[PDB]
Amino acid sequence: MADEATRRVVSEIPVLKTNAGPRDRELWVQRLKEEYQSLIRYVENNKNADNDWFRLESNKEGTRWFGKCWYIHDLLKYEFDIEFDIPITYPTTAPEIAVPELDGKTAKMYRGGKICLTDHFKPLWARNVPKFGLAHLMALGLGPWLAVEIPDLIQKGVIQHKEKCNQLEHHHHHH
Numbered sequence: 378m379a380d381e382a383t384r385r386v387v388s389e390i391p392v393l394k395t396n397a398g399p400r401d402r403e404l405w406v407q408r409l410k411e412e413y414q415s416l417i418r419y420v421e422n423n424k425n426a427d428n429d430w431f432r433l434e435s436n437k438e439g440t441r442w443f444g445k446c447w448y449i450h451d452l453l454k455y456e457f458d459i460e461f462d463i464p465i466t467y468p469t470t471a472p473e474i475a476v477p478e479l480d481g482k483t484a485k486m487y488r489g490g491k492i493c494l495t496d497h498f499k500p501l502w503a504r505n506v507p508k509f510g511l512a513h514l515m516a517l518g519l520g521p522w523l524a525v526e527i528p529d530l531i532q533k534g535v536i537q538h539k540e541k542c543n544q545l546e547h548h549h550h551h552h
Contacts, residue, residue, distance in 0.1 A: 387516060389422060390415050392508035398465050399440055408468075408510070409439045415512035433511070439463065442511065448523050452549035453541050455527065468509040471502055474519065482535035485526065493526065494518055 393411040397404030416433060423430045431446030440463050447456035461474045475490040487493045498518055502509075530536045541549060 383521075386422070387513065390419055390510075390512050390516065392513075393468075393510045394508065396468060396507040396509065398467060398469070399438070399463055400465060405439065409435075412510045412512060415510050419512050419516065431515070433459075433515075446515075446519070448527065450527075450531075452551060453538055455531075455536060455538050468511075468514075469506060471498075471514055471518065479526070479530055483526065483529055483533065485529065492519075492522065494522065495525070 391411075393408055393415070395404050395407040395411060397408050399405055420430055420432075428449055429447065431444065433442055433444035433446070435442045441460070442463070443460040445456050445458045447454050449455075457476060457478045459474055459476050459478075461472055464472050466472070471494075473491045476492055477490060479492070480486055480490050485493060501517070527536075531538070
């Protein structure tokens with residue numbers, strides 16, 4: 378019905394046709410470049426809209442991804458440092474993204490380090506398998522979740538980002 382804009386953007390993130398795990402390094406290296414291009418495409422696409430998202434990189438084997446993502450809201454930017462690895466279950470099944478920034482700063486946490494994905498994401502993932510990729514996982518999972526739980530973190534005052542400049546330039550206040 379609605380949420381068409383979201384699907385538009387996701388459609389601009391091509392599906393991976395190799396779709397392999399870290400076991401077959403040959404196909405893995407193929408999916409790796411497919412996935413990287415998908416990441417770059419999304420970031421570029423975002424930068425064109427003047428709303429930059431994230432930078433995420435991996436090690437030489439691509440077995441562990443680490444980086445940081447920043448979210449613009451109102452007039453403020455909220456960057457979070459994140460890390461996770463790529464189990465053999467991936468990309469057939471989604472892994473757990475570790476966000477040590479949010480963990481502890483909210484009572485609604487799955488487990489120490491593990492984020493709380495929506496119940497609707499689980500069947501959504503299974504229905505589309507395979508043809509997935511980190512770019513898809515991040516946008517379809519982390520992206521919407523930020524608009525769900527981050528308000529709690531912000532309002533509760535545990536995020537040290539109540540202002541960006543404070544009196545120097547201007548308050549986060551566009552009118």
